[PDB]
RNA sequence: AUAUAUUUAUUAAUAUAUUAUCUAUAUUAGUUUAUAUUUUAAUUAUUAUCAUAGUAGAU
RNA sequence: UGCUGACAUGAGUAACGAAAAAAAGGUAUAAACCUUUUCACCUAAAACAUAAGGUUUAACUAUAAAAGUACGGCCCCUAAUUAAAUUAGAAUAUAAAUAUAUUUAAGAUGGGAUAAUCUAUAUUAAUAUUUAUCUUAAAAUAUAUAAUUAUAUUAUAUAUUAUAUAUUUAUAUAAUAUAAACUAAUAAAGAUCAGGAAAAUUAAUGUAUACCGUAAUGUAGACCGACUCAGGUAUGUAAGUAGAGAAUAUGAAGGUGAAUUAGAUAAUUAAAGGGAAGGAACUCGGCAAAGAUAGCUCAUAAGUUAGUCAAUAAAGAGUAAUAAGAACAAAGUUGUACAACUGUUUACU
């Protein structure tokens, strides 16, 4: 403990002048730098292709479709088992993937609708359900064919 | 309404219990549903299953 | 010293001693599960 | 200290201060006086310093001449043990030292 | 200690409303604010007028807001791609809803 | 044992010309979780660099961690001399120090804020740090080039400096910024890191190829 | 002579140059997958060269790469997985509590940039208006929580 | 004051609605000691290595 | 070092005003200091807080 | 002292749970929220980074980013231990259940290659508990005139100068440069209390690198305690000044200043400071309070079981202190009864 009888410590040793090695760096930063305003990244520097494969997740490059843009339920019907019975394997395969792509688009729209705006319109949901009906009909047809 | 509930089927037991309410207690839920909706939204007929 | 803090949580011990396997892998634990099923309990074991 | 007043132990300056031959030892498992039911069957037996049991020979079947390389303290018993080396084959062994 | 019998309606009511020190007092010491003929408390200032002067002080001494140049000259598309939206939790939603837990002072009556 | 590595100390131009492990260049990395920026003389970094650059952290400018997934290369600046590379690194570190300790009040003066007066954030991600890093790089490059400008053919015309960006969108306006006489006279170009492979995972390979290209211009 | 990381890099370069996959295709063929992926709005921490998806929980990083490439032609240069937690919820205090779903999300690095389309104005599209849902819920809670004399208090919905 | 709109003690918790509840719900990836690994049926692809790595089949 | 005003066909001395007395290298691995090198990076008068009212002599 | 439900009295009483706060502005909305400044408090923490746990409580739904070289898990290997598993008709025993012994499988709190000059795990060719770092060595310096001691050094950690390259990759190295702590790798060596288990090399091909954890809280309002409870709760860093020290004082950065506020400060209660003359006269009892004239270097008695046990002896000396003028460590002798001694006990008299 530091009593009052304490005796000050000496300063630790210093190497003489003629023995001190000079530093490897002799110059340093500029003593004139000033704080400048940040520069935001600008989108003008980008050439986004209009045919980018991410547009396939949108219909007509629309953020979210309107009731007018959606296909009316009256004019739409899912595929029938007999109509899929006489479609070649390539045709069924292609229809499957078209159905899946449309379902992906509907899925993103429905997620934005039920997560952000939280509405209960349930239109995209039934449309995707119709597509799913066609899909399992295709599966049935392929199994029965084999 | 951020829930993610539209992506998974969780709590199947509870959901089935709520969706299969006994028919003799239906007025209990009918009352709250009716009194919790506006006049221009509601109808004077009994919802059916 | 003070009492009341007898439950010291640890998922490892909780599952090993009160888990579903900890009961389904024995005669007695199987009987516990069967009895709870018969009573109609929703949750048989941790 | 009061605990050193009645501490006496014989000292044998010829004993070997190093470790034993690992190939002639096995880890000694501690039971605590408890049997296969987990209940204390022999009381007053419990925790202590970690130990290894030494595979010492009680049969001496082989035969031939063997030279004693060193004498060691074996914590698992009260007598010292003697490390042997066979003159013709050189295999190492442990026996009770006389 | 502990009460030994339930106290009667009479005793409770006379103990509470009986004595005059426990009774609220009619506020006689009201008068007319010279700056506006409305009611105010005697030997007290008028809150409407005090707040009006403070509002004048605020409008005339408010420090200019700080609007960084790089942000004020930033396009809407870049603003959208750099600073997108977010969802506010229930706590911040309620906190932002301020008119349900803060009251402004109410004007007094015109003394005639 | 050989405890000390190249990334351990601060390496000057004498060391760089004795070893010639990399051409004259400075690496700038972005943190994918906090948005912060880290400067290095080498394609890699260790805890010492983080300690040097984040000296006084707070609830806003938290001290980042050395989990290699959140650190990604923002840009690679290729200079004409090891002297200039060291000069630029020192300038960047000095200006970071000024921005976070000595002149924090004016840095805050310039930063963006949201309601409640906090620097705009999404999670613990604050975009302003990358923008500040780009501005500091511009300023440091300007000082570095202003220091020396031979503008003559002493022995060889010498190569022209470059900035290899991760993405053209990061740098701001190419006319309102990066359009000064010093840069034009030196012939500084703004190139892009090739995206023909997994950039994040094969970062080291890409940077090593870039270094070879710069070493042999 | 060449490190395996360098060999992987040349593999990916060769794939892109030849137009084939920039990866090694597996042998477990799936002709009719019924997996669905959900594109998501960019966050402040992403760049125009990144895209994030909500993908099946049982999905895989290689699976996302292959799915994107063969079904859409999109080449994901680097994929990264973010599996979210499920918070406890209960639709009412008198019901068993149960955890919310755990959603899986992956970020992909792309070659060419992408920016989403603009938000629609309230009057343009009927589905994109939060006033009616939010007002309905506010009326819901007000009517469910009006106990006594608040029934005559004018509503704000 | 945790919530500026509640100046007096009324029963509301620091967070959430109820402090108690059922604990016999199934576990998931986020719960358990560091040793706990449940998985998401997303990788039966290859073989683990004797050292710790993983080789894709 | 900034800002307003001039002594020639950025700017020197004044009127002052504002801000700062830092950083960065070496001395065998890390932290501290100590001294060299780099930089404008200072040595006198008052004041305050904390140590039981920090402490002792009065009032 | 029936059971359930509703409502009363105590009563608008007690309480609001260790705490520093004040203006201006957001807002003529605010003690309680946000911002700025002033002031304080914790600072070998009330900070930073983590483990376990948990109603995601977070800077949130547009949400916690991994081929590995400081990434954990996963996987290989096993300890303690576990197992409706395992063993010529026949493993042994047993009212059933079942219990033994052996195999096998499982099981960390443990072990597991390479890697910044960056690195490569797969298939086919053979089958070292715990503890310590010398009296003595060599040069040059302070050294005295033969001293001898006084020390980097009697052992390691790297960067510069020179003697050289295969069109400057590995070396042979002679010089220059450390004050005190601490770290991981050597070498030698001390006591007895004698100190884990387990999975084997070159070749030729080969690698497109799966899955899960990652927010915030974590001497706590985010876990265990019926509560936003002064309790319980595992690690590492923990500025500088000062010290033997992680004691004690301060506090640079950081964080914070609290679901109670403003007045007033009666009797009285709690925690704290001072006190004339006297000094245990109090009380069952010096209970409580007060009392320290170095903390370093000296010196230190009778007894004695010979152990500076007594001993940190008491009293005392040296070092600036002479009216005093931080916190902390240090609180006197002696007889007797009982018990050799250190230790254990009635979680809560
Ligand atoms: Mg309990
Ligand atoms: Mg147990
Ligand atoms: Mg005995
Ligand atoms: Mg990598
Ligand atoms: Mg992951
Ligand atoms: Mg709790
Ligand atoms: Mg956990
Ligand atoms: Mg203090
Ligand atoms: Mg004080
Ligand atoms: Mg009373
Ligand atoms: Mg009273
Ligand atoms: Mg009171
Ligand atoms: Mg106010
Ligand atoms: Mg302390
Ligand atoms: Mg300290
Ligand atoms: Mg913390
Ligand atoms: Mg790993
Ligand atoms: Mg095993
Ligand atoms: Mg382990
Ligand atoms: Mg964590
Ligand atoms: Mg963290
Ligand atoms: Mg209790
Ligand atoms: Mg507490
Ligand atoms: Mg202290
Ligand atoms: Mg401070
Ligand atoms: Mg804190
Ligand atoms: Mg309080
Ligand atoms: Mg008082
Ligand atoms: Mg007195
Ligand atoms: Mg006196
Ligand atoms: Mg007496
Ligand atoms: Mg008396
Ligand atoms: Mg006493
Ligand atoms: Mg004497
Ligand atoms: Mg004597
Ligand atoms: Mg004491
Ligand atoms: Mg005793
Ligand atoms: Mg004792
Ligand atoms: Mg007791």
UniProtKB/Swiss-Prot annotation, chain A:
Biological process (GO), any one: mitochondrial translation
Record carries keyword Ribonucleoprotein: yes
Disordered: annotated span: 1-41
Biased segments, Basic residues type: 1-10
Record flagged with keyword Ribosomal protein: yes
UniProt KW keywords: Mitochondrion, Ribonucleoprotein, Ribosomal protein, Transit peptide
Polar residues biased stretches: 24-34
Disulfide pairings: none
Cellular component, GO annotation: mitochondrial inner membrane; mitochondrial large ribosomal subunit; mitochondrion
GO MF annotations in UniProt: structural constituent of ribosome
Protein origin, superkingdom: Eukaryota
Broad class of the protein's primary localization: mitochondrion
Locations listed in the record: Mitochondrion
Recorded family membership: Belongs to the universal ribosomal protein uL29 family.
Subunit structure: Component of the mitochondrial large ribosomal subunit (mt-LSU). Mature yeast 74S mitochondrial ribosomes consist of a small (37S) and a large (54S) subunit. The 37S small subunit contains a 15S ribosomal RNA (15S mt-rRNA) and 34 different proteins. The 54S large subunit contains a 21S rRNA (21S mt-rRNA) and 46 different proteins.
Comment field (misc): Present with 7700 molecules/cell in log phase SD medium.
Function: Component of the mitochondrial ribosome (mitoribosome), a dedicated translation machinery responsible for the synthesis of mitochondrial genome-encoded proteins, including at least some of the essential transmembrane subunits of the mitochondrial respiratory chain. The mitoribosomes are attached to the mitochondrial inner membrane and translation products are cotranslationally integrated into the membrane.
Protein name: Large ribosomal subunit protein uL29m
Organism: Saccharomyces cerevisiae (strain ATCC 204508 / S288c) (Baker's yeast)
Full protein: residues contained: 15 to 160 of 319
Swiss-Prot record, chain B:
TM ranges: none
Residue list for modification N-acetylserine: 1
Tree of life domain: Eukaryota
Localization, UniProt: Mitochondrion
Biological function: Component of the mitochondrial ribosome (mitoribosome), a dedicated translation machinery responsible for the synthesis of mitochondrial genome-encoded proteins, including at least some of the essential transmembrane subunits of the mitochondrial respiratory chain. The mitoribosomes are attached to the mitochondrial inner membrane and translation products are cotranslationally integrated into the membrane.
UniProt record similarity statement: Belongs to the universal ribosomal protein uL24 family.
Oligomeric and partner information: Component of the mitochondrial large ribosomal subunit (mt-LSU). Mature yeast 74S mitochondrial ribosomes consist of a small (37S) and a large (54S) subunit. The 37S small subunit contains a 15S ribosomal RNA (15S mt-rRNA) and 34 different proteins. The 54S large subunit contains a 21S rRNA (21S mt-rRNA) and 46 different proteins. uL24m forms the wall of the exit tunnel.
Protein name per its UniProtKB record: Large ribosomal subunit protein uL24m
Species of the source: Saccharomyces cerevisiae (strain ATCC 204508 / S288c) (Baker's yeast)
Residues shown, of full length: 2 to 50 of 297
From Swiss-Prot, chain C:
Origin: domain of life: Eukaryota
Protein location: Mitochondrion
S-S pairs: none
Function according to Swiss-Prot or TrEMBL: Component of the mitochondrial ribosome (mitoribosome), a dedicated translation machinery responsible for the synthesis of mitochondrial genome-encoded proteins, including at least some of the essential transmembrane subunits of the mitochondrial respiratory chain. The mitoribosomes are attached to the mitochondrial inner membrane and translation products are cotranslationally integrated into the membrane.
Additional information: Present with 200 molecules/cell in log phase SD medium.
Assembly and oligomerization: Component of the mitochondrial large ribosomal subunit (mt-LSU). Mature yeast 74S mitochondrial ribosomes consist of a small (37S) and a large (54S) subunit. The 37S small subunit contains a 15S ribosomal RNA (15S mt-rRNA) and 34 different proteins. The 54S large subunit contains a 21S rRNA (21S mt-rRNA) and 46 different proteins.
Protein family per UniProt: Belongs to the bacterial ribosomal protein bL34 family.
Record protein name field: Large ribosomal subunit protein bL34m
Organism per entry: Saccharomyces cerevisiae (strain ATCC 204508 / S288c) (Baker's yeast)
Biological classification of the source: Eukaryota, Fungi, Dikarya, Ascomycota, Saccharomycotina
Full-sequence portion shown in this chain: 60 to 105 of 105
UniProtKB/Swiss-Prot annotation, chain E:
Binding site for Zn(2+): 33, 36, 46, 49
UniProt entry keywords in alphabetical sequence: Mitochondrion, Ribonucleoprotein, Ribosomal protein, Transit peptide
Recorded GO CC terms: mitochondrial inner membrane; mitochondrial large ribosomal subunit; mitochondrion
Compartment list: Mitochondrion
GO terms of molecular function: structural constituent of ribosome; zinc ion binding
GO term, biological process aspect, one: mitochondrial translation
Superkingdom of this protein's organism: Eukaryota
Modifications after synthesis and translation: MRPL32 precursor is processed by the m-AAA protease (composed of YTA12/RCA1 and YTA10/AFG3), which cleaves the N-terminal transit peptide. Cleavage by the m-AAA protease takes place prior to assembly into the large subunit, an essential step for mitochondrial ribosome (mitoribosome) assembly. Proper processing by the m-AAA protease is dependent on the zinc-binding region within the tightly folded C-terminal domain of MRPL32: zinc-dependent folding halts degradation initiated from the N-terminus and triggers the release of mature MRPL32.
Main localisation: mitochondrion
Subunit and partners: Component of the mitochondrial large ribosomal subunit (mt-LSU). Mature yeast 74S mitochondrial ribosomes consist of a small (37S) and a large (54S) subunit. The 37S small subunit contains a 15S ribosomal RNA (15S mt-rRNA) and 34 different proteins. The 54S large subunit contains a 21S rRNA (21S mt-rRNA) and 46 different proteins. bL32m has a zinc binding site.
Protein family membership: Belongs to the bacterial ribosomal protein bL32 family.
Gene name of the encoded protein: MRPL32
